Amino acid sequence: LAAALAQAL
Ligand SMILES: *C(=O)c1ccc(-c2ccc(C(=O)OCC)cn2)nc1
Ligand SMILES: *NNC(=O)c1ccc(-c2ccc(C(N)=O)cn2)nc1
């Protein structure tokens, strides 16, 4: 989940 969002950065 964290990675799914982290791709933005
Ligand atoms: C959420 O974006 C998220 C959470 C966890 C994972 C993930 C990917 C790969 C592994 C892995 O290779 O584990 C080996 C024990 C674990 N968790 N991806 C994305
Ligand atoms: N928000 N994330 C990024 O901007 C980001 C872009 C690219 C990468 C990355 C990581 C690792 C490799 C590699 N070849 O091992 C390439 N690009 N991370 C984050």
Side-chain angles (χ1 to χ4, degrees):
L1 167 59
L5 276 56
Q7 69 181 307
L9 311 180

